[PDB]
């Protein structure tokens, strides 16, 4: 959580500008409660699902 | 509502709410019993079918928007307006607009007696039943 937070907390809107990050999200073992997506999803503000 | 518990606030609720929401959680229990078995569309027993669109009215009465808290007196009248059947035969997509009609049209001196006594006194529910009959519910 601290490594992901130290990355993702620098992607904000300041007063001078903003960074908007589009992040490809891989879900290990198709498990949305695995700690890497369950920690990554706490930072995401939108999801863009590209389906076949 | 089935899992949400609070064994410490029971002796810590508004006595006007304690006597009207003792009826609310039990009728939501039967609505939780009907819709958890009769989802198949098997039959309408026409008494369990009554408590299905009664409990759907208590659910829509318990919706709330964000960053708009309600005082406890304007809550226990909207629970009084729904469990006493004054909000009956209002269509379920009107109750958000209908419980706004209840609080807006009922005389604001009603909520001042209810806040100060903390209790729906016998002199008040006879009066508050009257002021709910004089309510322009949407859709009629």
């Amino acid at each position: 959580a601290t490594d992901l937070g130290g990355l993702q907390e620098r992607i904000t809107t300041t007063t001078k500008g903003s960074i908007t990050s589009v992040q490809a999200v891989y879900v290990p073992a198709d498990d949305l409660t695995d700690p890497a997506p369950a920690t990554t999803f706490a930072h995401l503000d939108a999801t863009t699902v590209l389906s076949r | 509502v089935g899992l949400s518990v609070s064994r410490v606030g029971s002796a810590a609720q508004f006595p006007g709410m304690k006597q009207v929401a003792g009826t609310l959680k039990l009728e939501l229990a039967q609505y939780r019993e009907v819709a958890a078995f009769a989802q198949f569309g098997s039959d309408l027993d026409a008494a369990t079918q009554y408590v299905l669109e009664r409990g759907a009215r208590l659910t829509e009465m318990l919706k709330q928007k964000q960053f708009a808290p309600i005082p406890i007196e304007r809550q226990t009248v909207a629970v009084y307006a729904a469990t006493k059947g004054f909000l009956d035969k209002v269509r379920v997509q009107d109750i958000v607009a209908a419980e706004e009609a209840v609080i807006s049209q009922v005389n604001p001196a009603v909520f001042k007696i209810l806040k100060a006594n903390g209790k729906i006194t016998p002199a008040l529910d006879a009066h508050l039943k009257a002021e709910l009959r004089k309510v322009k519910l949407p859709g009629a």
Binding site: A29, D31, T33, D34 | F40, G41
Partner: protein, 277 residues
């Protein structure tokens, strides 16, 4: 333990395919059996306007018929008319009469002898295997008139829609044994008709009651067959829904056990390494 859940998941995931398949199969059968049912619905009307509809007759001998399903994955359809045939046998039996019970469908012989063993005398089954015809219904009717009763009661589920199946009781009377006696209204209600038969009125009424019993048996076991298909299509869609919900809870619990497994063996490896290093 963590492998048996992976086999239970595959079992429930396959049941959620098999029941969806046979839901589609029962839908395809229902959409083409409804065609035959609403065409068969016509011929029952001239008899019920010519002979009336008298269920509560003083027959001294009756034959009740419970028209059930053959395949038994229908969802409370066959026991519904079992309740109805034990309600109508507790409606006419109050005077000391003989009752013969027959059933069409294997779910009738397995649920009628439990409620009543001595009056049950015949089991017709394997009806809906190829299709249901009128020669078959008339052969069943002739084997019903191997007995000599004064009434016949048919119990079947009528296909009102794909949702509602109202259990209909249908009655036929023996010709001058009870049919001529139940029509006598200060004279007769049948004397208005001019018989154009080759023989007398009793013979044309015998032939008419045999033909009426045949057409109501054919329509009864068409209506019950397609209402069986409709209740199977609705009963395998509450089944694949529950088998999807059970599979979802099994997948969530399997993922919890998977994560707990990886943490458990990892912690044991770390403990064994720190016990040395």
């Amino acid at each position: 333990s963590n492998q048996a859940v992976k086999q239970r998941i595959r079992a429930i995931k396959n049941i959620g395919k098999i029941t969806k398949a046979m839901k589609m199969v029962a839908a395809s059968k229902m959409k083409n059996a409804q065609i035959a049912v609403e065409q068969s619905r016509g011929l029952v009307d001239p008899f019920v306007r010519l002979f009336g509809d008298f269920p509560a007759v003083n027959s001294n001998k009756s034959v009740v018929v419970a028209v059930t399903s053959d395949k038994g994955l229908c969802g409370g359809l066959n026991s519904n008319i079992t309740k109805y045939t034990r309600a109508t046998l507790a409606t006419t039996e109050s005077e000391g009469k003989d009752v013969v019970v027959v059933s069409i469908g294997d779910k009738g012989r397995s649920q009628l002898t439990r409620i009543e063993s001595q009056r049950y005398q015949l089991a017709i089954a394997d009806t809906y295997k190829v299709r249901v015809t009128f020669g078959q219904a008339s052969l069943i009717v002739e084997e019903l008139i191997k007995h000599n009763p004064q009434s016949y009661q048919i119990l079947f589920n009528k296909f009102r829609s794909a949702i509602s199946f109202k259990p209909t009781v249908a009655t036929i009377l023996s010709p001058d044994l009870l049919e001529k006696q139940l029509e006598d209204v200060t004279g007769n209600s049948l004397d208005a008709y001019d018989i154009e038969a080759s023989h007398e009125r009793s013979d044309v009424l015998r032939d008419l009651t045999e033909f009426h019993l045949g057409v109501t048996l054919y329509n009864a076991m068409l209506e019950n067959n397609c209402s069986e298909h409709a209740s199977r299509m609705s009963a395998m869609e509450n089944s694949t829904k529950s088998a999807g919900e059970m599979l979802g809870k099994l997948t969530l619990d399997y993922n919890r056990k998977r994560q707990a497994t990886i943490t458990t063996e990892l912690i044991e490896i770390i403990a064994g390494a720190s016990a040395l290093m």
